Tab-separated table of C-alpha atoms and ligand atoms in Angstrom:
chain	number	residue	atom	x	y	z
X	208	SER	CA	0.000	0.000	0.000
X	209	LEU	CA	1.349	3.397	-1.079
X	210	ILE	CA	0.453	7.044	-1.641
X	211	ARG	CA	1.758	6.855	-5.196
X	212	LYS	CA	4.035	4.678	-7.340
X	213	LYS	CA	7.767	4.798	-6.625
X	214	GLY	CA	9.659	7.233	-8.834
X	215	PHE	CA	6.696	9.580	-9.011
X	216	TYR	CA	7.165	13.148	-7.847
X	217	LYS	CA	4.540	15.682	-6.782
X	218	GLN	CA	4.583	19.146	-8.381
X	219	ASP	CA	2.286	22.116	-8.942
X	220	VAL	CA	1.570	23.195	-12.509
X	221	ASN	CA	-0.777	26.094	-13.239
X	222	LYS	CA	-1.703	26.091	-9.541
X	223	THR	CA	-2.875	22.458	-9.629
X	224	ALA	CA	-0.969	19.431	-8.333
X	225	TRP	CA	0.543	17.052	-10.889
X	226	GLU	CA	2.042	13.591	-10.310
X	227	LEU	CA	4.740	12.779	-12.861
X	228	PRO	CA	7.277	9.942	-13.193
X	229	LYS	CA	10.901	10.984	-12.638
X	230	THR	CA	11.689	10.623	-16.351
X	231	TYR	CA	9.523	13.633	-17.182
X	232	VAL	CA	10.914	16.930	-15.928
X	233	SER	CA	10.405	20.693	-16.246
X	234	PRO	CA	6.584	20.575	-16.426
X	235	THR	CA	5.201	23.779	-17.940
X	236	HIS	CA	1.539	24.792	-18.208
X	237	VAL	CA	0.156	24.843	-21.748
X	238	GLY	CA	-3.606	25.076	-21.340
X	239	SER	CA	-6.688	24.140	-19.343
X	240	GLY	CA	-9.556	22.226	-20.918
X	241	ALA	CA	-13.063	20.868	-20.503
X	242	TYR	CA	-12.006	17.350	-19.533
X	243	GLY	CA	-8.405	17.870	-18.476
X	244	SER	CA	-5.314	20.074	-18.616
X	245	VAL	CA	-2.089	20.040	-20.623
X	246	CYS	CA	1.547	20.755	-19.855
X	247	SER	CA	4.810	20.358	-21.756
X	248	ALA	CA	7.622	18.187	-20.414
X	249	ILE	CA	11.176	17.148	-21.256
X	250	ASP	CA	11.798	13.393	-21.493
X	251	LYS	CA	15.222	13.210	-19.827
X	252	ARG	CA	15.870	9.850	-21.520
X	253	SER	CA	16.236	11.448	-24.952
X	254	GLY	CA	15.787	15.154	-24.328
X	255	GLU	CA	12.661	15.458	-26.466
X	256	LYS	CA	9.904	17.916	-25.546
X	257	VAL	CA	6.522	16.250	-25.059
X	258	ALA	CA	2.995	17.252	-24.134
X	259	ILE	CA	1.151	15.671	-21.221
X	260	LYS	CA	-2.592	15.747	-20.674
X	261	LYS	CA	-3.822	15.239	-17.116
X	262	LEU	CA	-7.311	13.774	-17.056
X	263	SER	CA	-9.598	15.743	-14.732
X	264	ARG	CA	-11.862	13.576	-12.564
X	265	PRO	CA	-12.493	11.052	-15.364
X	266	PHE	CA	-14.348	8.839	-12.892
X	267	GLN	CA	-16.870	11.466	-11.795
X	268	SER	CA	-19.542	9.797	-13.929
X	269	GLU	CA	-20.053	7.007	-16.455
X	270	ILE	CA	-20.092	9.572	-19.260
X	271	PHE	CA	-16.677	10.957	-18.284
X	272	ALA	CA	-15.131	7.520	-17.831
X	273	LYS	CA	-16.310	6.278	-21.246
X	274	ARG	CA	-15.055	9.504	-22.774
X	275	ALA	CA	-11.609	9.253	-21.160
X	276	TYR	CA	-11.401	5.572	-22.100
X	277	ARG	CA	-12.354	6.364	-25.687
X	278	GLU	CA	-9.645	9.030	-26.133
X	279	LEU	CA	-7.107	6.604	-24.717
X	280	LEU	CA	-8.054	3.890	-27.213
X	281	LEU	CA	-8.167	6.182	-30.249
X	282	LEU	CA	-4.714	7.605	-29.560
X	283	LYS	CA	-3.348	4.101	-28.978
X	284	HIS	CA	-4.880	2.850	-32.221
X	285	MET	CA	-3.904	5.652	-34.599
X	286	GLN	CA	-0.396	5.280	-36.015
X	287	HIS	CA	0.126	8.019	-38.583
X	288	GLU	CA	2.429	10.989	-39.088
X	289	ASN	CA	-0.407	13.509	-39.383
X	290	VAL	CA	-2.529	12.202	-36.511
X	291	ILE	CA	-1.701	12.933	-32.862
X	292	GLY	CA	-0.393	9.799	-31.155
X	293	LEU	CA	0.316	8.177	-27.805
X	294	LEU	CA	3.922	7.991	-26.628
X	295	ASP	CA	3.036	6.867	-23.126
X	296	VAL	CA	0.197	6.422	-20.629
X	297	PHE	CA	0.508	6.448	-16.865
X	298	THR	CA	-1.212	6.862	-13.532
X	299	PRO	CA	0.467	7.574	-10.173
X	300	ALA	CA	-2.092	5.223	-8.616
X	301	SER	CA	-0.874	2.023	-6.986
X	302	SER	CA	-4.268	0.299	-6.735
X	303	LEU	CA	-7.935	0.605	-7.705
X	304	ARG	CA	-8.944	2.636	-4.655
X	305	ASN	CA	-5.953	4.848	-5.438
X	306	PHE	CA	-6.989	5.255	-9.105
X	307	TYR	CA	-8.386	8.772	-9.536
X	308	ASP	CA	-6.900	9.845	-12.862
X	309	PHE	CA	-4.350	9.084	-15.566
X	310	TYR	CA	-2.014	10.940	-17.907
X	311	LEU	CA	-1.410	10.835	-21.654
X	312	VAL	CA	1.950	11.647	-23.234
X	313	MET	CA	2.055	12.980	-26.803
X	314	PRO	CA	4.452	14.680	-29.237
X	315	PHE	CA	4.591	18.360	-28.328
X	316	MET	CA	3.057	20.600	-30.979
X	317	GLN	CA	3.987	24.257	-30.724
X	318	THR	CA	0.755	25.810	-31.963
X	319	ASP	CA	-2.271	25.313	-34.227
X	320	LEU	CA	-3.899	26.701	-37.367
X	321	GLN	CA	-6.369	28.843	-35.440
X	322	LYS	CA	-3.517	30.800	-33.856
X	323	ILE	CA	-1.457	31.271	-37.018
X	324	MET	CA	-4.553	31.915	-39.140
X	325	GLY	CA	-4.189	35.298	-40.813
X	326	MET	CA	-0.673	35.178	-42.225
X	327	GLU	CA	-2.332	35.422	-45.681
X	328	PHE	CA	-0.995	31.987	-46.680
X	329	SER	CA	0.789	31.414	-49.965
X	330	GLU	CA	-0.494	28.550	-52.119
X	331	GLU	CA	2.562	26.414	-51.337
X	332	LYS	CA	1.815	26.565	-47.615
X	333	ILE	CA	-1.864	25.839	-48.223
X	334	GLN	CA	-0.920	22.999	-50.579
X	335	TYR	CA	1.441	21.578	-47.962
X	336	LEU	CA	-0.859	21.881	-44.949
X	337	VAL	CA	-4.054	20.795	-46.676
X	338	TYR	CA	-2.143	17.817	-48.090
X	339	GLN	CA	-1.238	16.787	-44.533
X	340	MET	CA	-4.828	17.187	-43.306
X	341	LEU	CA	-6.067	14.948	-46.078
X	342	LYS	CA	-3.475	12.272	-45.357
X	343	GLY	CA	-4.471	12.272	-41.699
X	344	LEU	CA	-8.144	12.110	-42.656
X	345	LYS	CA	-7.602	9.268	-45.123
X	346	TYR	CA	-5.938	7.300	-42.322
X	347	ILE	CA	-8.583	7.817	-39.622
X	348	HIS	CA	-11.462	7.320	-42.065
X	349	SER	CA	-9.773	4.104	-43.238
X	350	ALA	CA	-10.031	3.028	-39.599
X	351	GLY	CA	-13.749	3.810	-39.746
X	352	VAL	CA	-13.340	6.873	-37.523
X	353	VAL	CA	-14.842	10.223	-38.520
X	354	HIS	CA	-13.789	13.466	-36.847
X	355	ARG	CA	-17.100	15.371	-37.080
X	356	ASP	CA	-15.598	18.521	-35.517
X	357	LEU	CA	-12.616	19.509	-37.655
X	358	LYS	CA	-11.474	23.123	-37.281
X	359	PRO	CA	-8.217	25.160	-37.291
X	360	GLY	CA	-7.905	24.714	-33.513
X	361	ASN	CA	-7.983	20.941	-33.989
X	362	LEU	CA	-5.067	21.237	-36.416
X	363	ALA	CA	-1.747	21.337	-34.565
X	364	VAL	CA	1.447	22.570	-36.216
X	365	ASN	CA	5.103	23.088	-35.348
X	366	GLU	CA	7.727	25.534	-36.585
X	367	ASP	CA	8.335	23.461	-39.749
X	368	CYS	CA	4.602	23.591	-40.433
X	369	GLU	CA	4.319	19.862	-39.858
X	370	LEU	CA	0.700	19.092	-39.106
X	371	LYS	CA	-1.092	16.726	-36.745
X	372	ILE	CA	-4.859	16.283	-36.536
X	373	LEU	CA	-6.330	16.776	-33.049
X	374	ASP	CA	-9.637	16.522	-31.249
X	375	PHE	CA	-9.416	18.724	-28.163
X	376	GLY	CA	-12.900	17.738	-26.977
X	377	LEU	CA	-16.566	18.399	-27.757
X	378	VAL	CA	-22.345	27.422	-30.397
X	379	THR	CA	-20.386	28.282	-33.562
X	380	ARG	CA	-20.499	25.731	-36.388
X	381	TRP	CA	-18.534	27.557	-39.078
X	382	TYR	CA	-16.770	24.393	-40.270
X	383	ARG	CA	-19.657	21.998	-39.833
X	384	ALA	CA	-21.178	20.249	-42.838
X	385	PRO	CA	-24.708	21.452	-43.740
X	386	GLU	CA	-26.048	17.894	-43.568
X	387	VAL	CA	-24.915	17.829	-39.940
X	388	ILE	CA	-26.282	21.278	-39.113
X	389	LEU	CA	-29.668	20.602	-40.702
X	390	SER	CA	-29.755	16.781	-40.535
X	391	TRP	CA	-31.502	16.929	-43.899
X	392	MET	CA	-29.842	13.733	-45.088
X	393	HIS	CA	-27.557	11.146	-43.551
X	394	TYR	CA	-23.869	11.943	-43.508
X	395	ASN	CA	-20.805	9.928	-44.492
X	396	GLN	CA	-17.075	10.378	-43.992
X	397	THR	CA	-16.970	13.419	-46.268
X	398	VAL	CA	-18.389	15.601	-43.495
X	399	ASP	CA	-14.752	16.133	-42.604
X	400	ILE	CA	-13.999	17.109	-46.197
X	401	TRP	CA	-16.531	19.931	-46.065
X	402	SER	CA	-14.501	21.112	-43.082
X	403	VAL	CA	-11.197	20.970	-45.012
X	404	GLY	CA	-12.808	23.083	-47.715
X	405	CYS	CA	-13.891	25.711	-45.183
X	406	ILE	CA	-10.401	25.796	-43.680
X	407	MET	CA	-8.607	25.936	-47.027
X	408	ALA	CA	-10.906	28.765	-48.149
X	409	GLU	CA	-10.073	30.715	-44.995
X	410	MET	CA	-6.345	30.259	-45.564
X	411	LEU	CA	-6.859	31.515	-49.120
X	412	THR	CA	-8.891	34.556	-48.072
X	413	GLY	CA	-7.987	35.384	-44.486
X	414	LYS	CA	-11.652	35.438	-43.490
X	415	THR	CA	-14.037	32.780	-42.184
X	416	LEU	CA	-16.133	31.383	-45.033
X	417	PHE	CA	-19.451	30.624	-43.314
X	418	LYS	CA	-20.826	32.221	-40.139
X	419	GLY	CA	-24.354	33.096	-39.026
X	420	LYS	CA	-26.612	33.850	-36.057
X	421	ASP	CA	-28.601	30.632	-36.433
X	422	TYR	CA	-28.627	27.583	-38.697
X	423	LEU	CA	-30.922	29.177	-41.291
X	424	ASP	CA	-28.669	32.237	-41.479
X	425	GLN	CA	-25.688	29.926	-41.966
X	426	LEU	CA	-27.534	27.938	-44.623
X	427	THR	CA	-28.213	31.205	-46.441
X	428	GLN	CA	-24.501	32.076	-46.298
X	429	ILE	CA	-23.637	28.595	-47.580
X	430	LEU	CA	-26.049	28.721	-50.526
X	431	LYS	CA	-24.464	32.019	-51.582
X	432	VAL	CA	-21.367	29.977	-52.352
X	433	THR	CA	-22.802	26.603	-53.383
X	434	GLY	CA	-25.828	28.059	-55.166
X	435	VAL	CA	-29.316	26.667	-54.675
X	436	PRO	CA	-29.085	22.892	-55.305
X	437	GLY	CA	-31.222	21.455	-58.088
X	438	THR	CA	-33.317	18.345	-58.607
X	439	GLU	CA	-30.792	15.547	-58.118
X	440	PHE	CA	-29.792	16.805	-54.674
X	441	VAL	CA	-33.263	17.829	-53.496
X	442	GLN	CA	-34.566	14.286	-54.095
X	443	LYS	CA	-32.087	12.856	-51.599
X	444	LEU	CA	-33.217	15.024	-48.687
X	445	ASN	CA	-35.072	13.126	-45.966
X	446	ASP	CA	-36.420	16.364	-44.513
X	447	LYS	CA	-39.649	17.340	-46.276
X	448	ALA	CA	-39.714	20.833	-44.766
X	449	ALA	CA	-36.131	21.355	-45.932
X	450	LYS	CA	-36.897	20.009	-49.410
X	451	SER	CA	-39.879	22.364	-49.580
X	452	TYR	CA	-37.928	25.375	-48.268
X	453	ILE	CA	-35.110	24.885	-50.786
X	454	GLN	CA	-37.574	24.513	-53.677
X	455	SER	CA	-39.250	27.729	-52.534
X	456	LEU	CA	-36.043	29.765	-52.707
X	457	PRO	CA	-34.929	31.881	-55.628
X	458	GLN	CA	-33.200	29.072	-57.533
X	459	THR	CA	-29.910	30.943	-57.758
X	460	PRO	CA	-27.418	29.057	-59.988
X	461	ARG	CA	-24.001	28.045	-58.737
X	462	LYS	CA	-20.292	28.799	-58.513
X	463	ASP	CA	-17.580	29.956	-60.834
X	464	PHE	CA	-15.265	29.709	-57.833
X	465	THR	CA	-12.947	31.723	-60.059
X	466	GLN	CA	-15.398	34.547	-59.359
X	467	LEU	CA	-15.968	33.646	-55.692
X	468	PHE	CA	-12.235	33.355	-55.026
X	469	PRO	CA	-10.747	35.884	-57.494
X	470	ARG	CA	-7.208	35.241	-56.216
X	471	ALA	CA	-7.226	31.431	-56.217
X	472	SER	CA	-5.396	29.396	-58.862
X	473	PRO	CA	-7.543	27.261	-61.216
X	474	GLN	CA	-6.489	24.057	-59.436
X	475	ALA	CA	-7.222	25.627	-56.044
X	476	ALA	CA	-10.714	26.782	-57.040
X	477	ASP	CA	-11.429	23.467	-58.780
X	478	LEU	CA	-10.581	21.452	-55.660
X	479	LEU	CA	-12.554	23.887	-53.514
X	480	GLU	CA	-15.492	23.325	-55.867
X	481	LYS	CA	-15.272	19.593	-55.211
X	482	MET	CA	-14.954	19.692	-51.418
X	483	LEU	CA	-17.616	22.373	-50.894
X	484	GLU	CA	-20.203	20.065	-52.476
X	485	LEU	CA	-23.680	19.835	-50.951
X	486	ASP	CA	-24.359	16.365	-52.364
X	487	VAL	CA	-22.555	14.062	-49.951
X	488	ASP	CA	-22.340	11.458	-52.719
X	489	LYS	CA	-20.492	13.834	-55.028
X	490	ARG	CA	-18.240	15.376	-52.359
X	491	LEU	CA	-14.619	14.249	-52.570
X	492	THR	CA	-13.326	11.667	-50.126
X	493	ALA	CA	-9.913	12.146	-48.506
X	494	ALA	CA	-8.230	9.571	-50.774
X	495	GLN	CA	-9.887	11.147	-53.811
X	496	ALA	CA	-8.834	14.667	-52.816
X	497	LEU	CA	-5.228	13.525	-52.378
X	498	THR	CA	-5.111	12.767	-56.119
X	499	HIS	CA	-5.990	16.345	-57.093
X	500	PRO	CA	-3.350	18.293	-59.127
X	501	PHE	CA	-3.268	20.908	-56.330
X	502	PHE	CA	-0.995	18.530	-54.420
X	503	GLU	CA	1.242	17.679	-57.389
X	504	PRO	CA	4.462	19.146	-55.929
X	505	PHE	CA	3.938	17.331	-52.613
X	506	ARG	CA	2.181	14.081	-53.389
X	507	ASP	CA	3.776	10.828	-52.261
X	508	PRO	CA	1.404	7.811	-52.516
X	509	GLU	CA	3.492	5.835	-49.990
X	510	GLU	CA	2.793	8.540	-47.399
X	511	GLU	CA	-0.938	8.066	-47.848
X	512	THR	CA	-1.180	4.928	-45.735
X	513	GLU	CA	-4.342	3.398	-44.300
X	514	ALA	CA	-5.052	1.897	-40.895
X	515	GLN	CA	-4.208	-1.815	-40.832
X	516	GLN	CA	-7.173	-2.629	-38.592
X	517	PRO	CA	-10.432	-0.716	-38.041
X	518	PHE	CA	-10.888	1.053	-34.714
X	519	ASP	CA	-12.734	-1.680	-32.868
X	520	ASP	CA	-14.190	-0.676	-29.517
X	521	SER	CA	-16.510	-3.510	-28.545
X	522	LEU	CA	-17.677	-1.374	-25.606
X	523	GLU	CA	-18.812	1.766	-27.425
X	524	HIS	CA	-22.309	0.467	-26.744
X	525	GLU	CA	-21.714	-1.106	-23.348
X	526	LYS	CA	-22.922	0.435	-20.095
X	527	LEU	CA	-20.829	-0.612	-17.114
X	528	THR	CA	-20.339	0.916	-13.673
X	529	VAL	CA	-17.826	3.703	-13.068
X	530	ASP	CA	-15.879	1.084	-11.144
X	531	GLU	CA	-16.211	-1.221	-14.138
X	532	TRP	CA	-14.863	1.456	-16.463
X	533	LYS	CA	-11.957	2.121	-14.095
X	534	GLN	CA	-10.993	-1.547	-14.268
X	535	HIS	CA	-10.875	-1.444	-18.060
X	536	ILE	CA	-8.949	1.818	-18.194
X	537	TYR	CA	-6.675	0.368	-15.505
X	538	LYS	CA	-6.032	-2.709	-17.642
X	539	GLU	CA	-5.326	-0.685	-20.784
X	540	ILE	CA	-2.714	1.396	-18.959
X	541	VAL	CA	-0.949	-1.606	-17.412
X	542	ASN	CA	-0.495	-3.484	-20.687
X	543	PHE	CA	0.547	-0.492	-22.802
X	544	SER	CA	3.965	-0.469	-24.488
X	545	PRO	CA	5.997	2.239	-26.307
B	253	N61	C1	-10.476	12.304	-28.827
B	253	N61	N1	-9.466	12.319	-29.892
B	253	N61	N2	-9.619	11.855	-31.193
B	253	N61	C2	-8.480	12.041	-31.862
B	253	N61	C3	-8.211	11.665	-33.330
B	253	N61	C4	-7.722	12.887	-34.085
B	253	N61	C5	-7.156	10.602	-33.365
B	253	N61	C6	-9.456	11.140	-33.935
B	253	N61	C7	-7.549	12.657	-30.972
B	253	N61	C8	-8.203	12.819	-29.766
B	253	N61	N3	-7.629	13.399	-28.535
B	253	N61	C9	-6.733	14.559	-28.585
B	253	N61	O1	-6.457	15.092	-29.662
B	253	N61	N4	-6.210	15.020	-27.312
B	253	N61	C10	-5.317	16.147	-27.102
B	253	N61	C11	-5.176	17.191	-27.974
B	253	N61	C12	-4.272	18.244	-27.676
B	253	N61	C13	-3.522	18.207	-26.495
B	253	N61	O2	-2.651	19.215	-26.158
B	253	N61	C14	-1.460	19.229	-26.883
B	253	N61	C15	-0.937	18.069	-27.516
B	253	N61	C16	0.223	18.145	-28.202
B	253	N61	N5	0.893	19.334	-28.279
B	253	N61	C17	0.416	20.466	-27.679
B	253	N61	C18	-0.748	20.438	-26.982
B	253	N61	C19	-3.674	17.165	-25.622
B	253	N61	C20	-4.568	16.121	-25.919
């Protein structure tokens, strides 16, 4: 029986107490979150700077425990250059009564696209970053995982503009796909692609593509760009009141993204045209978008790997006790290996 595992030291970071193994030193506050808090650390073994997320009361309720367990499994499962990954997992706990939280160790990423958004962005930078997003998205989608909430803040970058896809947690819906906002038809993996389009557009222009007070105001702003959709799309809607409403609009024709984005190159506008597509059957997939000529100078098919196995959480549907979730999280931590 112990207070904490041997080789664990106690230390305040951002006015909260942290419990870190001796191998991780110089903890430095990065940010506070909805479900935890992050610091940066130096791994004395190799001198590399890492990020560490402290889970905040993950066992306060079944919802929290399942959430914390899910993030742990996703990060473990994803093995790709442009997806954030797990380097290590630990808890200072020595038993199950002792188990109150756990920590995740990840590659440290200096900043994100939200923070550096507004440096005008040359096409080469956009080409390079959007190419990395798409690779990351091809990978996770190939594992059967969709992001659903992709945005500049969920896109981490370093000095070299190397990109890693994040999901910081779970209002503004500027990057959300219309079919999600309006639930007017069922969505597929290309919901994330609509988000890439919105982000790319913003990098091209400097300004957010689609805002709005409410969903109908955002739909209006969207249709300005996509034009009012015709017969083939309207038929697919499962929302009668939406189908009606659309058919009642001034049927304003679409596009010439050359006009809408008067600075964009023909290949840029063309790809934009294909990601910002209302019909979720016509919208580009990640693998399809990777083949676009816009990524000609950067494309390397070997880099565009897929997940070997699908993300398979047998307990996404289960409903066990907080104690029961602790036992499973406990097990996953014990048998982890770098
Ligand atoms: C739930 N979920 N899903 C994903 C996929 C993208 C693989 C689908 C990732 C996460 N969790 C996460 O990003 N956690 C996280 C993000 C940022 C962070 O803080 C930093 C990490 C690295 N560098 C700086 C800050 C800490 C944890």
